[PDB]
Copies of this chain bind each other. A is one copy, B any other.
Amino acid sequence: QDSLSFGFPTFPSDQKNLIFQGDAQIKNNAVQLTKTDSNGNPVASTVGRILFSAQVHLWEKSSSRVANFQSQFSFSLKSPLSNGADGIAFFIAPPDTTIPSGSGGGLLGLFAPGTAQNTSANQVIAVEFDTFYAQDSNTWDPNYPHIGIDVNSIRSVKTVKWDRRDGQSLNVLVTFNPSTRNLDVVATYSDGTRYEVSYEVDVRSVLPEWVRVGFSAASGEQYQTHTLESWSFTSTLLYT
């Protein structure tokens, strides 16, 4: 299809079109990307991702068209302590993507250790909400919580300082305009606090014509829940 759209105002238990990977599962009408114990408490060493089953036609080489897309979602992070880790990310990747071996902790379940910073070895565009930046393990991170745009590397091509708020839902809008090639990210808390980050990227040189979209999250030794509360997505192939 030239156009595709879907909306999950909430996430009931009887899902049919979601691909669950790792520890991801539905709990209380929401998607819990990372594992939680009996009493809904976050645990260490866990990775989880979800992908929508239908493939998205991002660009078409024959017609020279590229899709414009918009992804709107909300999530909350909760942790018994304050150094919650590691973060959640919205990502776009080849249809057969799977959790890379040893991609836990700071790699957010998106990259493999040996190639995490090699752009020519990966095929992924992601918007990360990174809450852990200890320089001993996350050497590629700026020294503060941040939202970042990742293009084939865990080392973001662009970041903006962000504030982690335990238990508060963050509303996010990610938009890609094929006319300008700008990938824009706007995130807001209910009180109006806003964060913005954008980057120019030619999706045609990074990803295949057909892709899958979804979310990924992980917790290494430090932990927190990564709760995806709602998600809507729309894409339309356009002539630039």
**A161 → chain B, closest Cβ, in Å?**
34
Among A2, A62, A209, which residue has the most Cβ atoms of chain B within 10 A?
A2
In the complex, the answer to whether A3 meets B6 with C-beta atoms within 8 Å is yes
In chain A, positions 163-214 with a C-beta closer than 8 Å to chain B are: 209-210
A window 10-49: CB within 8 A of B: 10, 12, 14, 16-17
Expressed in whole angstroms, the minimum distance between the Cβ of A74 and any Cβ of chain B is 15
Residue among B5, B16, B95, B210 making CB contact with A5, cutoff 8 Å: B5
Say yes or no: B1 contacts A3, CB within 8 Å. no
A54 within 8 A of B: yes
Q: Does A156 contact B (CB under 8 A)?
A: no
Number of copies: 2
Please determine whether A54 and B17 come into contact, CB atoms closer than 8 angstroms: yes
Known pairs A53-B53, A53-B54, A54-B17; A1 contacts B12 (CB<8 A): no
Q: Bin chain A's interface residue count.
A: 20 to 34
Rounded to whole angstroms, the CA-CA distance of A14 and B62 in the bound complex is: 10
**Residues in chain B near residue A17, CB distance under 8 A:** 1, 54-55
Contact of A95 among B8, B16, B55 (CB under 8 A): B16
Q: Does A121 contact B (CB under 8 A)?
A: no
- Which residues in B have their C-beta under 8 angstroms from that of A60? 12
Residues from chain B with Cβ under 8 Å of A232 in the complex: 3
Residue numbers of A with Cβ under 8 A of B are 1-10, 12, 14, 16-17, 53-55, 57, 60, 62, 95, 209-210, 232
Known: A1-B6, A3-B232. 15 other contacts (CB 8 A): A2-B7, A2-B8, A2-B9, A3-B5, A3-B6, A3-B7, A4-B6, A6-B54, A14-B210, A16-B55, A16-B57, A16-B95, A16-B210, A17-B54, A53-B53
In order of increasing CB-CB distance, the 3 nearest A-B pairs are: A1-B6, A3-B7, A16-B55
